[PDB]
Amino acid sequence: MENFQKVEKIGEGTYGVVYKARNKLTGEVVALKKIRTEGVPSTAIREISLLKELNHPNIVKLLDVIHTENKLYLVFEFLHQDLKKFMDASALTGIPLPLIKSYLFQLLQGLAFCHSHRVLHRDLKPQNLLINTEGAIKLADFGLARAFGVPVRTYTHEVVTLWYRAPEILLGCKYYSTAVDIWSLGCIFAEMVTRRALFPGDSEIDQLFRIFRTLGTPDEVVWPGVTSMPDYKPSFPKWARQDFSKVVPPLDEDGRSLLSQMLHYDPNKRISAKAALAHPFFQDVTKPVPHLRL
Numbered sequence: 001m002e003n004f005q006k007v008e009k010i011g012e013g014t015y016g017v018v019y020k021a022r023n024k025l026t027g028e029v030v031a032l033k034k035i036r037t038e039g040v041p042s043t044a045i046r047e048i049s050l051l052k053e054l055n056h057p058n059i060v061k062l063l064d065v066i067h068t069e070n071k072l073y074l075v076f077e078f079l080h081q082d083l084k085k086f087m088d089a090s091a092l093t094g095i096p097l098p099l100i101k102s103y104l105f106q107l108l109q110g111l112a113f114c115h116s117h118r119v120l121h122r123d124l125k126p127q128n129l130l131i132n133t134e135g136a137i138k139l140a141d142f143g144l145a146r147a148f149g150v151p152v153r154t155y156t157h158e159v160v161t162l163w164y165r166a167p168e169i170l171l172g173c174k175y176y177s178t179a180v181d182i183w184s185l186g187c188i189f190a191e192m193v194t195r196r197a198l199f200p201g202d203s204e205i206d207q208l209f210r211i212f213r214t215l216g217t218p219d220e221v222v223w224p225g226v227t228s229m230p231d232y233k234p235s236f237p238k239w240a241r242q243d244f245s246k247v248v249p250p251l252d253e254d255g256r257s258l259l260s261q262m263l264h265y266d267p268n269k270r271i272s273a274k275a276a277l278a279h280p281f282f283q284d285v286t287k288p289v290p291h292l293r294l
């Protein structure tokens, strides 16, 4: 629109491109996300519009939802850096454990809030976690899959990230629960610690098998009902579980314990965001300021 002075294209999301823009009249700098374009479910605009009510320190504020020329634009408060960029910038030294701990605590607070309001993210990844100079971290792009439905790609020949997808999704479950966000966050937690993606699959089956090779091929003992899932194949190789100590070295036992609960196969056994906040790992949590190069 002509209401802005578009600073630059910010990035490509699963549901659309994001832009940094300034209001010509108010001068406020915001993030503008453009969704796909033959109509779009109107029941979805209602659901998305409801998200404007969400207010929490760890959720990026949704300022406006605009429907024009059959396009959907989401106007969000702007943050200067995403966690993927920050992790890449911190690859030589690594993110200090106290900062990793602070970020995980805040993200769980954000998820606990959304989940208590029956809002799921469903596509959590480093790219949609944003940080500022004051040590805060916030989740952006909640509830798009629930309102619109996860399509095939972003909008134009894009390589979707499968790395943070929960096993029940990869196995074809039709109904998702808030547990899918805890899984994604667990994967991100591991990544901040080791400075390498935990399950970097290059295909849906490679994604699934990388999880199996690490946590062990699931069975009815650890995950009742798994052999009945839509995409389950009795022909899946049976890999034995690896020690966690090999998974995220050199994370201490409190951290490893918490991560293992975030990565349980059974969505029912997987820890909730609220319960995770009470885990001993957070007994000494603080709020460090990051070294951000903007």
Ligand SMILES: Nc1nc(N)nc(-c2cc(Cl)ccc2O)n1
Pocket: 010, 011, 018, 031, 033, 060, 076, 077, 078, 079, 080, 081, 082, 127, 130, 140, 141
């Ligand atoms: N990649 C990237 N980088 C920056 N600096 N900001 C964003 C961003 C994305 C959304 Cl959806 C909402 C607000 C934002 O600030 N995304």
